[PDB]
Design a protein around this ligand. Sequence first.
Ligand SMILES: CC(=O)N[C@@H]1[C@@H](O)[C@H](O[C@@H]2O[C@H](CO)[C@@H](O)[C@H](O)[C@H]2NC(C)=O)[C@@H](CO)O[C@H]1O
Length: 369
Amino acid sequence: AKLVCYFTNWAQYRQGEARFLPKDLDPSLCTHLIYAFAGMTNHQLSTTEWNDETLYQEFNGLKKMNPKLKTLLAIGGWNFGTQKFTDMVATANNRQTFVNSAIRFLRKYSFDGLDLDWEYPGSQGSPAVDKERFTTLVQDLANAFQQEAQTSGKERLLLSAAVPAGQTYVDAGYEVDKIAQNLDFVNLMAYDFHGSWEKVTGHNSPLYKRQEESGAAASLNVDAAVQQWLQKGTPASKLILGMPTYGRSFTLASSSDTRVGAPATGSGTPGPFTKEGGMLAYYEVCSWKGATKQRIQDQKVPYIFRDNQWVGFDDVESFKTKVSYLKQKGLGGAMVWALDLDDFAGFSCNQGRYPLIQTLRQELSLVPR
Ligand SMILES: CC(=O)N[C@@H]1[C@@H](O)[C@H](O[C@@H]2O[C@H](CO)[C@@H](O)[C@H](O)[C@H]2NC(C)=O)[C@@H](CO)O[C@H]1O
């Protein structure tokens, strides 16, 4: 089993106990640690924060403490957009520039692989031609990593990708059967199914549909997303089930209607540390005072409300349920977005350090013995 965990290079800017620093990294928590994010400059892999090189040293330095650990560098992410990917994959020349730069960069900074986080080929401004061009990029990288291993004698660089759960994005961008052959593993972003972009409450990451749902909505759940990727050709062993250590929040139209599917007027109030309306870290919801926690019976996940605020999130129990699910489906492991949104320092939830991610590790039978 794998436990793939994302580090984010902006968590260092949060205030107080929420500030995530190198000391908070645990070398034996996860099997694979992925650094979010690198960017691109003139079609070449590049850093995005002023101190990334310092953090790379710390991050990859964890392997001294745990030599089994593998690290990857993720390129892209939501905020990065699509244009630079589009321009880079447009020509064989630009792809070659990128691929060669990636190999040199990963070797220079001691990463074990690259995680592709283009959000997304064929959508968010990216043209339809990018679906096949993404397939080619994945192939170019896989083949070049294979060649570098042969020439250098070093262990081959890993290639993974973070991929969307919704059919609209999947079909616009991803030749699933083709790319799955060339990726070492596939990080399924089984979250952000619902959020304050909608005008009714819905859960960030429900396991199953609700009985009331129909149409496309009935596929906006973890089980449907997993089945989608499997049926379209991803080997179960390569599919890694993403898990969110955050929730998505709403302002309710009325404090008297707190159901799933109740009218909402917009994003929930920003959290005191994360300061982003519409999301909350686990450590910002786990210890809500004077609130009412509820479970969505069909969907196997909790929500919580207080006055006109409503949040769908994941807890220890829902993580257990989801690991039982992934094991039943024979998947390759779990992925987590993100280290810094769990109660990494044990300051809030009275559950010790990393209560959610330690649950994944335990349920996957990955505890260091
Ligand atoms: C691997 C992965 O899930 N990548 C995406 C993430 O970028 C995204 O997290 C969001 O990243 C933005 C930067 O690109 C941040 O500004 C933003 O705050 C952050 N949002 C959260 C909840 O962490 C995650 C999560 O939505 O999913 C992908 O879209």
